Design a protein around this nucleic acid. Structure first.
Ligand SMILES: Nc1ncnc2c1ncn2[C@@H]1O[C@H](C[C@@H](N)CC[C@H](N)C(=O)O)[C@@H](O)[C@H]1O
Ligand SMILES: [Mg+2]
Ligand SMILES: [Mg+2]
Ligand SMILES: [Mg+2]
Ligand SMILES: [Mg+2]
Ligand SMILES: [Mg+2]
Ligand SMILES: [Mg+2]
Ligand SMILES: [Mg+2]
Length: 257
RNA sequence: GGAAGUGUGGCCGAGCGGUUGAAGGCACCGGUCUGAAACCGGCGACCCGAAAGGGUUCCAGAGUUCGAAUCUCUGCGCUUCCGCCA
């Protein structure tokens, strides 16, 4: 079992996610957390690894804020897209692009990094425990891991809301190739264990899209976006709403001695 | 054993001498698609060939024909009737 290279769903992903409120809300919530992290990490500029950075929307926004950003990805097609978008934003000088697995990234870094982005990758890698161990090894003491993983509860809940009862009865097996539903939706409690057992200390948990995907009237996703975002922002950091997010964003600290 | 009748593709089902190795359907495989029907393409075996691809086979084979899934014959399997057995 290999990790999912996004080559043959690059366009679909960019269109269905970043071309809709799904991507817009993802980025909005995520950057609420990230800007808190950046400020709490002092005002110096940072070294940021975006492991599995894809088309680079998050990595470029980090670069616009002045940091040195290294993006690596399995997919040649995603790397090329990220290269173009970065040029067209004028941030290519602050950015490095590496066509390698996150597992193999350590040999491409001259020095450790301050902050790691691992966003919507964990649910696509066959051996999550192992990748997290590698990412730990390239993070300086006191560094932060920004981990956004796809939540199995959100897929159960939305399939229920949508009325796909037969599919849920059958355990929701992933048989559709080239869907954007991930190969390995994660149990959040298990992911929290993975981080704590491997020494990380969890500083925050945020639900990402905790109401949006379940709306009875999908058109309100766009027509009512500003009000929806305000209420997503209000509730997405308390239970049960954390555990209802389609994604969950965990902020975790590498300890210092 | 003897007639008649019968045998189409994985399963169904069109095919009363040619554009039918085979319509159409289900299944199976692949493709398209948010969030799990539809649409698109394919889809037996054996033989030949390095490959491209060619051949045979519509129970099996032989024949008639320019041409056979389609006509004739022989065999094989089945069905009914008879006869066998009692
Ligand atoms: N082991 C891996 N190492 C590096 N990149 C990976 C790996 N597995 C998957 N990917 C890439 O991870 C990306 C996952 C996508 N969900 C996009 C993530 C991107 N960070 C985003 O938030 O949009 C794809 O571009 C994949 O090609
Ligand atoms: Mg039949
Ligand atoms: Mg055929
Ligand atoms: Mg057919
Ligand atoms: Mg078809
Ligand atoms: Mg024949
Ligand atoms: Mg013919
Ligand atoms: Mg003949």
């Amino acid at each position: 079992a290999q990790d999912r290279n996004f080559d043959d769903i690059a366009e679909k992903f960019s269109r269905n996610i970043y071309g809709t409120t799904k991507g817009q809300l993802r980025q909005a919530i995520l950057w609420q957390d990230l800007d808190r992290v950046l400020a709490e990490m002092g005002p110096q500029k940072l070294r940021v690894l975006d492991a599995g950075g894809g088309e680079g929307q998050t990595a470029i926004k980090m670069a616009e804020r002045g940091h040195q950003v290294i993006l690596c990805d399995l997919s040649a097609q995603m790397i090329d897209r990220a290269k173009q978008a970065a040029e067209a934003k004028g941030v290519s000088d602050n950015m490095q692009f590496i066509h390698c697995a996150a597992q193999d990234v350590a040999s491409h870094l001259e020095t450790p990094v301050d902050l790691i982005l691992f966003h919507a990758v964990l649910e696509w890698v066959a051996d999550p425990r192992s990748v997290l161990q590698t990412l730990w090894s390239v993070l300086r003491p006191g560094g932060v891991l920004s981990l956004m993983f796809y939540n199995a509860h959100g897929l159960l809940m939305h399939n229920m809301v949508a009325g796909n009862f037969d599919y849920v009865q059958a355990g929701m097996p992933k048989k559709k190739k080239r869907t954007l539903s991930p190969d390995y939706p994660r149990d959040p409690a298990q992911v929290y264990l993975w981080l704590e057992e491997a020494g990380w200390q969890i500083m925050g948990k945020t639900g990402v899209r905790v109401f949006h995907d379940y709306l009875r009237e999908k058109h309100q996703q766009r027509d009512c976006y500003e009000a929806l975002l305000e209420l997503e922002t209000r509730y997405c950091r308390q239970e049960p709403y954390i555990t209802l997010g389609r994604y969950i964003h965990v902020t975790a600290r590498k300890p210092q001695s």
